[PDB]
């Protein structure tokens, strides 16, 4: 049946949901902190910002209403429910989306401390095997950070996407290359996983440009086999036009840490995208000794993205939206 919505007035703008979702409170630009009173669990639930107003809010709401509902994985976020005050498609005009508030981003945990190896291990571990998922689909995030990291009281951790940021991107993004292959996300993970074990920031750039001298500080300058990728002739040129940087050894940075998280960590941040270890193997490596079950790291089934590249009227949008919440299975709790 129909389940019974009740009408509220959060952020500067009128919310209704299902009575079921209690304590509504808002958290940030729109999502609210919730009590689930069917099942007894905390939730984030998302209003959409006028979801079907442009063909490019269509177009996104399409896209996350589909690829979360596609996402079933420990380490990854994924909808609890998904839900319309509509009754009828010509009435659809808001969508709302419920998953686990976990606590806390991996901001409110580290709060500017060293955490001990122990701890790293265990969710840098989580963040990996929630990668090796995503990347299975086919699926780059493309902007992995501490704030795009969900984690409870006992460091479960969930990869989600709140749709300086910067200090995390792979240097590829940020000079705008086109290409881009999985392995972004394994930078991002290396200058996270440095975060935790020092305690601060490691490319804490002022602009665009002083980001790019902080990481080839430490990873050193192109060698002539990464020249050789370089598509433009003005910036060939220019790389060349410096003075060479030699490759900073990582174990005089990291002083006193695991030489296993060392070592990680010189894999992860290559400067050469195409030599980064990737989601898999990095699940592989010694410094997960503990935690590591080649049986329990399970991926995705494949996913399509064209789906989500077309161009399509918002009528269209807006039904095929429609769809996909009418057709929602939520997981058994
Ligand atoms: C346009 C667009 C499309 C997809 C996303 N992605 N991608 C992911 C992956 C599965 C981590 C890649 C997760 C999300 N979304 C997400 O976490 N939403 C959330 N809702 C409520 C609390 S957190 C975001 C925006
Ligand atoms: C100015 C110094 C920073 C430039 C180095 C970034 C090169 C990243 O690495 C590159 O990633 C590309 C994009 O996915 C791949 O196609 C290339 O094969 C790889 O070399």
């Known amino acids: 049946e129909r389940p019974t919505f009740y009408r ?187 975060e935790l074990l020092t305690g601060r920031t490691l490319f804490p750039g002022t602009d665009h440009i002083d980001q790019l001298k902080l990481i080839l500080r430490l990873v050193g300058t192109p060698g002539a086999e990464l020249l050789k990728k370089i598509s433009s002739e003005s910036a060939r040129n220019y790389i060349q036009s410096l003075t060479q940087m030699p490759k900073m050894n990582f174990a005089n940075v990291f002083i006193g840490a695991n030489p296993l998280a060392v070592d990680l960590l010189e894999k992860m941040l290559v400067l050469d995208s195409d030599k980064r270890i990737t989601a898999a193997q990095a699940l592989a490596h010694a410094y997960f000794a503990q935690y590591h079950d080649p049986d329990d790291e399970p991926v995705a089934d494949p996913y399509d993205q064209s789906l989500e590249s077309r161009d399509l009227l918002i009528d269209e949008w807006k039904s095929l939206t429609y769809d996909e919440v009418i057709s929602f299975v939520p997981p058994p709790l």
Not at 145 to 169: C, H, M, Q
Not at 180 to 185: R, S
């Open 8 to 194: 509220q007035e959060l952020n500067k703008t009128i919310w209704e949901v299902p009575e079921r979702y209690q304590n509504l409170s808002p958290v940030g630009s729109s999502v609210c902190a919730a009590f689930d009173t069917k099942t007894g669990l905390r939730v984030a639930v998302k209003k959409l910002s006028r979801p079907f107003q442009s063909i490019i809010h269509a177009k996104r709401t399409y896209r996350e209403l589909r690829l979360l509902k596609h996402m079933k994985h420990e380490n990854v976020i994924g909808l609890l429910d998904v839900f319309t005050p509509a009754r009828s498609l010509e009435e659809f005009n808001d969508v709302y989306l419920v998953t686990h508030l976990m606590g806390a981003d991996l901001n409110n945990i580290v709060k500017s401390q060293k955490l001990t190896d122990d701890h790293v291990q265990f969710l840098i571990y989580q963040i990996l095997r929630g990668l090796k998922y995503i990347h299975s689909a086919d699926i780059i995030h493309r902007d992995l950070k501490p704030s795009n990291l969900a984690v409870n009281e006992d460091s479960e951790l969930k990869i989600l996407d709140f749709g300086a940021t910067r200090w995390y991107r792979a240097p590829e993004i940020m000079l705008n290359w086109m290409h881009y292959n999985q392995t972004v996300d394994i930078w991002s993970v290396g200058c996270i996983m440095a």
